[PDB]
Enzyme design. Structure first.
Site, mmCIF file in Angstrom:
data_model
loop_
_atom_site.group_PDB
_atom_site.id
_atom_site.type_symbol
_atom_site.label_atom_id
_atom_site.label_comp_id
_atom_site.label_asym_id
_atom_site.label_seq_id
_atom_site.Cartn_x
_atom_site.Cartn_y
_atom_site.Cartn_z
ATOM 1 N N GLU A 1 7.546 130.092 80.178
ATOM 2 C CA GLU A 1 6.144 129.747 80.014
ATOM 3 C C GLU A 1 5.283 130.039 81.251
ATOM 4 O O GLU A 1 4.495 129.202 81.675
ATOM 5 C CB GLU A 1 6.031 128.267 79.600
ATOM 6 N N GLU B 1 13.670 128.985 70.192
ATOM 7 C CA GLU B 1 13.445 127.549 70.020
ATOM 8 C C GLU B 1 12.812 127.238 68.668
ATOM 9 O O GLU B 1 11.931 126.386 68.555
ATOM 10 C CB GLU B 1 12.561 127.024 71.157
#
Ligand SMILES: [Mg+2]
Ligand code: NA
Length: 354
Positions: A149, A259
């Protein structure tokens, strides 16, 4: 009454020619209950929390391997691949990293020469963290979330980079150094990933695209993009998902879904049903259609997609419940997987096993 997860065809076998089928795990779930599901359906795992920076080096030079070691021992014993999550992140990361030699936060330093010194120090701590971690788990890990991220959801700078302490101190050097260090100690055949959420969404997608393009031009070894795929029933569209994966394949990169969960709710996730029992079958059916469409895409793009990991196993345990509760005054239950809270199969399972 649906059959139990152990009484139906294996997901791993079903997608054997296409990609790995993965699950995120905690050490307490490697007993029989959730172990029966894992062994039957999955050929890959990842640590939901046990391998994040603060989970491994809470204080400088003191390492806490136990949770990570258990997960690795399970991978070995049951012959599963293992994604490493994650070497670099702006959350679940220990404070000591970002304190200068005098014990003061590096962000509140003004003298430019001292900032340069602090930047070098931060990069050296990072390097030692990655060195130590990689030397331990080198022969078990099959894909590395090298950074997590690092691209922003907005546009606070023209490159679209997340302005975490990592960036505030080092600019993009931590990303370069993360990848360079991981390549150096893991070896040439280690598959190094950059992982993020909303990889399907512009402008973020284009910022990510431009970032990996700039670093590849400087010989920074990125082998793939990790699409977290924290998605919803009707968002993002199948074509936005497709377009993103095609774009990164065209740079010669690999794609992995890392994910995956298919929330029953929008964003923010409200209104949420209070309990699992209160969720109407209607909603599980809309979820099944979505899954069918998702996995037809995945299977269509299996040349460019090596692994599909769900961020959990069955509907009893998911971080999406935290988010539901957050936005519904402490009461909320989401149900994102193909297995229900008692490990019985859901409509979604039937639509991806066929
Ligand atoms: Mg299907
Ligand atoms: Na593949």
């Amino acid at each position: 009454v649906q059959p139990f997860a152990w009484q139906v065809a294996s997901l791993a076998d079903r997608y054997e020619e296409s990609f790995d089928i993965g699950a995120a795990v905690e050490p307490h779930q490697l007993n029989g209950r959730q172990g029966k599901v894992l062994k039957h359906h999955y050929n890959s795992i990842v640590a939901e929390n046990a391998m994040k920076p603060i989970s491994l080096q809470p204080e400088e030079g003191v390492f806490t391997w136990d949770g990570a070691d258990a997960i690795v021992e399970f991978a070995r014993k049951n012959n599963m691949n293992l994604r490493f999550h994650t070497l670099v992140w702006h959350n679940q990361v220990p404070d000591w990293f970002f304190l200068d030699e005098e014990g003061n936060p590096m962000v509140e330093e003004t003298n430019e020469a001292k900032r340069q010194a602090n930047k070098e120090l931060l990069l050296e701590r990072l390097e030692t963290h990655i060195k130590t971690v990689v030397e331990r788990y080198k022969d078990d890990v099959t894909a590395w979330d090298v950074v997590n991220e690092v691209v922003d959801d907005g546009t606070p700078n023209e490159r679209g980079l997340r302005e975490s302490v990592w960036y505030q101190i080092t600019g993009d050097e931590y990303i370069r150094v993360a990848f360079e260090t991981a390549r150096k100690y893991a070896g040439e055949d280690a598959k190094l990933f950059i992982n993020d959420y909303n990889t399907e969404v512009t402008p973020k997608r284009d910022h990510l695209y431009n970032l990996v393009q700039d670093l590849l031009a400087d010989g920074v070894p990125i082998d793939g993009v990790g699409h977290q795929a924290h998605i919803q029933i009707d968002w993002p569209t199948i074509d936005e998902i497709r377009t993103s994966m095609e774009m990164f394949a065209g740079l010669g990169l690999d794609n992995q879904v890392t994910e995956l969960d298919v929330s029953l709710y929008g964003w923010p996730p409200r209104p949420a049903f209070p309990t699992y029992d209160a969720i109407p079958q209607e909603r599980f059916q809309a979820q099944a259609d979505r899954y069918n469409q998702l996995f037809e895409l995945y299977e269509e793009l299996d040349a460019d997609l090596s692994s599909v990991t769900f961020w959990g196993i069955a509907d009893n345990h998911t971080w999406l419940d935290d988010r539901a509760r957050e936005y519904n005054d402490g009461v909320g239950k989401d149900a994102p997987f193909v297995f229900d809270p008692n490990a019985r199969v859901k409509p979604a399972f039937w639509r991806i096993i066929d």
